[PDB]
Amino acid sequence: APEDLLERLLGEMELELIELRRALAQTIATFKSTERQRDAQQLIAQRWYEKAQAALDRGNEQLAREALGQRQSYQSHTEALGKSLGEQRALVEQVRGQLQKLERKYLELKSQKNLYLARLKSAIAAQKIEEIAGNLDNASASSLFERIETKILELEAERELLNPPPSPLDKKFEQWEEQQAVEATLAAMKARRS
Amino acid sequence: ALVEQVRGQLQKLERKYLELKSQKNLYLARLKSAIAAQKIEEIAGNLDNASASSLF
């Protein structure tokens, strides 16, 4: 039953299409999580930047050497995460485009599904009646009206011999006698009480 | 086009259905008459010298 498959196939398309939506959730979550680390490490440098800002305060340049030398151990992480953050931006944008385009197509197919199903129902249901009406017959009259007439013709003729009709002679006499009677007794009545 | 095309089939087919039904009763009525009214003659005009039911 191919028509049922349409429901089955499009069901699967919805079973996993939503799962794609779930997968997108994890990817976007990691983007937020990675962003949370960048500012945190930036803040640590910012905190050391405040001490570094006060490290040289009063002219204590010697101390700032260790502070600034320490911060670079954090800046390298910032750049590494900053660059990696840009890479993840493409994936979230690229993947979303697929979902948007695919989502539009799913409903588009569904619209045609009912339409073709409706045409199938009409051309299969409304079709079957004609094989019931126009059955094989001399005039395609269901093939039963023809056979029925044979039965009627048989019976009406199956017994006409059983009660033979008047022969053309005795019918001629019966008619002539009737004609005579209806014109001779009539003639008798015509002259009897003219 | 499809809605217009399909409707034409329904209209034409709908007319034909009742048309067949009218003949159905008519042929049935003729069958009943020619089968019921026929059977009496095989009861009256049975095989006889004068077809007088064969019992007289």
UniProtKB/TrEMBL annotation, chain B:
Annotated ADP 5 binding sites: N46, N49, S51
Coiled coil: 1-56
Binding site for ADP 4: D48, N49, S51, S53
Keywords from the named record: Coiled coil, Nucleotide-binding
Record-listed ADP 6 binding positions: D48, N49, S51
Protein name: Chloroplast membrane-associated 30 kD protein
Family that this chain belongs to: Belongs to the PspA/Vipp/IM30 family.
Species in which this protein is naturally found: Synechocystis sp. (strain ATCC 27184 / PCC 6803 / Kazusa)
Section covered of the full-length record: 113 to 168 of 223
Keyword Transferase belongs to the record: no
Residues that coordinate or bind ADP 1: K21, D48, N49
The UniProt record lists the keyword Nucleotide-binding: yes
Signal peptide per UniProt: none
Positions contributing to ADP 2 binding: N46, D48, S51, S53
Record: residues binding ADP 3: D48, N49, S53
